[PDB]
Amino acid sequence: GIQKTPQIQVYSRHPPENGKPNILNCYVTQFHPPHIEIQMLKNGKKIPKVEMSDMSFSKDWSFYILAHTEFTPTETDTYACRVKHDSMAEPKTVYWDRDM
Amino acid sequence: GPHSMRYFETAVSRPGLEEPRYISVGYVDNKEFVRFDSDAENPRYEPRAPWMEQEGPEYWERETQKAKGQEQWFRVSLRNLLGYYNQSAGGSHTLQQMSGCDLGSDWRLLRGYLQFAYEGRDYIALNEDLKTWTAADMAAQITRRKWEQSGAAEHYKAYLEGECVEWLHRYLKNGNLLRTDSPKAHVTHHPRGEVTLRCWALGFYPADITLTWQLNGEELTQDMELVETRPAGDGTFQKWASVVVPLGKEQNYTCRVYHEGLPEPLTLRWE
Amino acid sequence: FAPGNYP
Amino acid sequence: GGLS
């Protein structure tokens, strides 16, 4: 078909240190059509005010977007990015690994 | 160094919406500097970099009327494309365009660009000679014939060779943009018998960068794992690359980082 | 300086 | 008068 399945990365702006506030990024790329849903999660809960960049596309015509929010990592708290897109039957979840 | 200007334009129709949404994004040296969005409160071109607020009100009035024209043009084009591809009502459709010019380090025009895509796939593009058209789809031959007979290429050639260059020159003077941020690199150690070595590159701009791992002079592709270069969110980019190594003999492996901002490529070992 | 497509 |  015409659909292009998004690629996803989850990562912080600055090197993670437990207890120090930081920015968590969810970087979603290479998808078509441009409509998309991105939710950022902490321990399964919706993170309330996730900032979303404006629509842009790359030279291969595929669209991309960066979601981000403020967060303070700890030892045990989990963070993930969950994406909904017409290229997939079900939403895709990618978990945050502080080493990547 | 070389320079460039680009306008990336998109029109999207949906079933529940009754007119399509038009978005245009201007780029100078691959950095966003203007944007227009038909969904906006009162649609207008807006500056997206501080150095563009220099332009007076009549500049933004002219650009805005051009965008409003592009919007009508895209709207008509989406309708004709439904006919060309025998598509019925009830679906979502996308029409994109890229145009602009590349300048060499001498500020002379190297090449112009004008490309279109429908449903995210190549539809028609102006050839590098700026006189002829390339179209692959059978449906796109209808367009190519119409454009060949109407001298549309002459119109675009005048823009790409004239205004695109003249205005880019002006933009570069108004922002004289030359900034590059070099990568700061470190290698982390991930005892997984083995440990994983991960070479990090952070804080660099532009995004283009190359990471390599070497063992005794040989670059190692035996499962050199990467990630796609990603934005930190502050204008800089991140990247890393990793190798699988037997534990203990860590000092046998070096990471190298190449980037146009560096005086010379970095060389890194885990310390 | 945005382009204007050929009408 | 568009594409086309």
Which long-range CB contacts under 8 A does A45-48 form with residues at least 24 apart?
A47/A71
Same domain, B154 and B239: no
B179, B196, B219 — which closes off a domain? Answer: B179
Same domain, B92 and B187: no
Same domain, B16 and B125: yes
Same domain, B24 and B98: yes
Between CA A40 and CA A79 the distance in angstroms is: 7
Same domain, B153 and B187: no
Is B120 close to A62, i.e. CB distance below 8 A? yes
Q: Which of A61, D3, A34 is nearest to B97 (CA)?
A: A61
Q: Which of B28, B52, B155 is the best residue to mutate to test the C interface, defined by the most C CB atoms within 10 Å of its own CB?
A: B155
Total domains present in chain A: 1
Q: What distances in angstroms separate CA B149 from CA B124, B133, B144, D3, one per listed residue?
A: 15, 12, 9, 13
B127, B144, B179 — which closes off a domain? Answer: B179
DSSP class of residue A5?
P
Q: Which domain holds residue B74?
A: 1-179
Instruction: Please list the alpha-helical segments (H only) found in B112-215.
Output: 139-150, 152-158, 164-174
Is A9 close to B227, i.e. CB distance below 8 A? yes
Same domain, B143 and B164: yes
Residue B30, Ramachandran bin (φ over 0: left; ψ between -120 and 50: alpha; else beta) = left
Task: Enumerate residues 1 to 7 of chain C having a beta carbon within 8 A of any beta carbon in chain B.
Answer: 1-7
Q: Which of A12, A39, A10 is nearest to A24 (CA)?
A: A12
Quote the minimal CA–CA distance from A45 to chain B in Å: 23
Q: Which domain holds residue A46?
A: 1-100
Question: What CATH number has the domain bearing residue B37?
Answer: 3.30.500.10
B155, B179, B203 — which closes off a domain? Answer: B179
Question: What CATH number has the domain bearing residue A80?
Answer: 2.60.40.10
Question: What CATH number has the domain bearing residue B223?
Answer: 2.60.40.10
Total domains present in chain B: 2
* Closest CB to A2 among B25, B119, B227: B119
* Closest CB to B230 among A2, A27, A99: A27
Phi, psi of A24 (to 5 degrees): -100, 130
What token pair was written down for B192?
């997984």
Same domain, B188 and B106: no
Cβ contact B73:C5 at 8 Å: yes
DSSP class of residue B120?
T
* Closest CB to C2 among B24, B147, B150: B24
Is B12 close to A27, i.e. CB distance below 8 A? no
Q: Which of B85, B84, B36, B87 is nearest to B64 (CA)?
A: B36
Q: Obtained via which technique?
A: X-ray
Is C6 close to B99, i.e. CB distance below 8 A? no
Q: Which of A31, A29, A36, A38 is nearest to A2 (CA)?
A: A31
Cβ neighbours for B13, distance < 8 A, ≥ 6 positions apart = B19, B20, B78, B92, B93
Same domain, B167 and B202: no
Instruction: Please list the alpha-helical segments (H only) found in B47-184.
Output: 57-84, 139-150, 152-158, 164-174
Same domain, B109 and B243: no
Cβ neighbours for B137, distance < 8 A, ≥ 6 positions apart = B123
Quote the minimal CA–CA distance from B92 to chain A in Å: 8
Q: What distances in angstroms separate CA A27 from CA A39, A70, A80, B42, B109, one per listed residue?
A: 12, 15, 12, 29, 34
Between CA B68 and CA B77 the distance in angstroms is: 14
Sign (positive or negative) of CA dihedral C5, A63, B139, B81: negative
Between CA A61 and CA B184 the distance in angstroms is: 31
Quote the minimal CA–CA distance from B237 to chain C in Å: 28
Sign (positive or negative) of CA dihedral B219, B225, B228, B231: negative
Smallest CA–CA distance from B141 into chain D, residue: D3
Cβ contact B211:B256 at 8 Å: yes
What token pair was written down for B76?
């008509």
What token pair was written down for D1?
């008068």
Cβ neighbours for A47, distance < 8 A, ≥ 6 positions apart = A39, A40, A41, A69, A71
Residue B71, Ramachandran bin (φ over 0: left; ψ between -120 and 50: alpha; else beta) = alpha
Quote the minimal CA–CA distance from C5 to chain B in Å: 7
CB hemisphere CA count around A9 (13 angstroms): 23
Identify the burial level of A28 via C-beta atoms within 10 angstroms of its C-beta, where 0-12 means exposed, 13-18 middle and 19 or more buried.
buried
